[PDB]
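new request in #modeling-help
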Amino acid sequence: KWYYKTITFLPELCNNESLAAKCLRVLHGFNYQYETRNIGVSFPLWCDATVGKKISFVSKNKIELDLLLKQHYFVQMEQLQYFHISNTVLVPEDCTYVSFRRCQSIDKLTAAGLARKIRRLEKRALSRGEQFDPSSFAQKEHTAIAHYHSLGESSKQTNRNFRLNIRMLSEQPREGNSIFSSYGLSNSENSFQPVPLI
Amino acid sequence: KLPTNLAYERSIDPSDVCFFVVWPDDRKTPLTYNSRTLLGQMPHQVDFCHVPYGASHIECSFSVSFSSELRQPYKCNSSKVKQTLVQLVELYETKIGWTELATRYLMNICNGKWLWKNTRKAYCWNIVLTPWPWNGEKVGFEDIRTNYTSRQDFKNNKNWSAIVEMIKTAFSSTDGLAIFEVRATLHLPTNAMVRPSQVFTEKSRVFQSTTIDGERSPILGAFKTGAAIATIDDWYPEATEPLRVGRFGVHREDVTCYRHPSTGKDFFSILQQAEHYIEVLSANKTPAQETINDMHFLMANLIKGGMFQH
Amino acid sequence: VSGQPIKSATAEALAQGNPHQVDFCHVPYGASHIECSFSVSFSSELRQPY
Amino acid sequence: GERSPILGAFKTGAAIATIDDWYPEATEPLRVGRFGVHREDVTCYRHPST
RNA sequence: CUGAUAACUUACAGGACGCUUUGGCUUCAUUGCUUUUCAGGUGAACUGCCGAGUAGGUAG
């Protein structure tokens, strides 16, 4: 009971992570004008290097899906032929279902990240009682992480240029209606809702 | 010339630059680094070595040993070029003494050139070197960014006229020795990037490390700390920067080599002009254009020398 | 021997660092000293030939 | 169960037997061979000609 | 355009009986492998919040 409009990156020489990020940033520029969190992420040909050539925006009622692909970025990037839009096809009844959850537990492993964690643990050691020695906090030793295909986003009301990193793990075709965030998503704190990978 | 067996032994024997983190409690712990190996879905090991949170400052320790193994060649083969080189050394020692090379070799020990990139985004770094044989205190230096910059700043009363001698009396005297124990205190900012030496990886950023107190610590090379204190050569056709005192004067970062045999300034056009350079050092007066600049390089290359065979 | 070669020893081709694999041994940090032990034996096997 | 460097059995026999300074002129003790061979200066003194 | 032209060799079969290779033996003197070495993250993936947290979550 879902619709999906695929957009595919044409011109032979492009960084898909650099462009998919901008598409998600346009989706973040969207839906802080209208109070909704309904639109998907859905990377169909997600490889183990360079998240692939197209991106679809899976959602419900579809009166707010069509409006996202006429935002004068997609139209301007369709005029000069770099994108190619599919005209709102219903999802087929037999599909593979994946969750594109933003982990946010990889930027908490980096040295600047775990220092920030320790420095927050310092600040809430004033739940009184003499506090931890910061010498007894080691950069584990031999960490291993997979796979997370990191995209390059940035904040607007500050000059932080964060980045979000997303993994592909798949499960249990349907639960939710729909919820799942302003960066599309399959993470946001309650809804681990499958997206059906058009 | 080049008598099919002419090897030398190095005079300057540097050691590994061991890192230590000192705390506000005034106790020293070994610096530790993590290794992020990527695990692509159905080895690429990347290391990161940052200063841990709440650390007072960092201490880098190494021991350098100036010896007298440039007088006699190791294996000469022929006893015609043997007295040539020995005569050329003692004539150089007699005419224009070891003060210049001693100063050039000690200046880039006493300003933290052997840290390479740990001076970058550093508030202050203080060097304390203990010489041997010595009869007094530790020769300690102040903040080396404002104080000690030029040659004249290093030429202060109680810390230059006594440690250039013992290097001059090392290179001159037979079996002469000078063992300097150098300790440098880096005042780095909160979570500052420490850059140690990396392994070869014959085929991304795996660090060179050794075990201290049962845990691995970064090392900053054994040869990456001898190739820093021997960045002297600025006697090549025109002049740009101090290079590594090599045979063909090879620049590393820029891929080309200045002082190349087409120019005829390398350590084969100059070594084969030995018989000329004994004639020039006879009487007055040696010019500082193409004689002293060449003799400096000759001796700077004889200190590093081995092995000259063809 | 003993001229100059053809342009195979070019300036870009003499800045190509050649790798060695050598055994490095050093005194570990925080050691008191090194202790070297062996045994020698003087005998009377020069009186009569073997 | 740890490999360690050894300095050799035959090298330290060629250390405790560097006593030969009874050779045509004299400078330093050589290794006691037959043909008074010197290692550094590759030419051997005490040759069958002398 | 061939020493040309033409061309059915076929039936049946029991190698078996027996066997001691053995005696003796000293490889051992002497030994220096050594000289010299830059692997290279331009600044860059941040700052918060919830949580008893080297657990786990979260916004931008």
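bot summary: Residues 28, 104-107, 110, 112-114, 116-118, 120-121, 124, 127, 132, 136-138, 140, 150, 152-163, 165, 182, 187-189 of chain A lie near RNA strand E (CB under 10 Å from a C1').
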